[PDB]
Amino acid sequence: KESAAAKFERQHMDSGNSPSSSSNYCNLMMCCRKMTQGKCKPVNTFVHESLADVKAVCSQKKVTCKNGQTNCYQSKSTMRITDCRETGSSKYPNCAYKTTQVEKHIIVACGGKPSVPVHFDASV
Amino acid sequence: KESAAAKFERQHMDSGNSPSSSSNYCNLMMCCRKMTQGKCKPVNTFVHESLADVKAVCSQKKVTCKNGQTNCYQSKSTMRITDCRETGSSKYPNCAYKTTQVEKHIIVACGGKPSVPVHFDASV
């Protein structure tokens, strides 16, 4: 169970000199989007473009996925993305991430009908 | 179950938002700290001082609680806090918060033995 003292910590404590700094984004986002459940997802990319633009990638340049499959697509334009990668000392339940903001083309794997993104493959 | 498409959206989509966006701090924190589970917590304050300093408040100025309770103490100094308040359009499952940073004295309700902070009462 969670003690009352632990709950107060969870709900109200965030010690830090620049709590809202962009360097804390990955830590907060990976937590919020539940990618730190039982383990720390080692790498994950967030795309800051409209869902419509990302879905449209499924009808763009067809490329080969890192895994051999050929259901991957690369965006014609670059997109604003944030790479979140576990730091050296990241260790469950203390997951830690480095935030890197870049502008690159995205490669996603598409599936279903109509075709929509189902996995983030890489960026170039 | 969560579809492959919905999962892709959860893990990878953050449209119209950016890591450098400080006003989005409350949205990320309320989510990450589980205060948007099944309902939207209306108001919540995060303290950016060290935990040792917040715990020390339990031995400071005894005051009447502002919210309905007892055993409240007011910090002798001001502390850096972020006030998170639901926006007028907030509605579960779409919770939304307005972020406000400010420096004020905090009043916390203490309990346990040793006495430690268990509820956040108000900032003055």
Ligand SMILES: Nc1nc2c(ncn2[C@@H]2O[C@H](COP(=O)(O)O[C@@H]3[C@H](O)[C@@H](CO)O[C@H]3n3ccc(=O)[nH]c3=O)[C@@H](O)[C@H]2O)c(=O)[nH]1
């Ligand atoms: N993963 C994660 N990171 C968080 C959270 N809240 C804030 N952060 C981030 O964590 C960074 C600093 O971490 P810290 O100084 O180690 O502070 C941690 C964190 O704010 C809190 C909840 O996890 O526990 C703290 N913690 C964690 C482990 C430990 O040994 N000691 C300790 O104080 C900040 O830059 C911020 O971005 C959270 O709930 N989860």
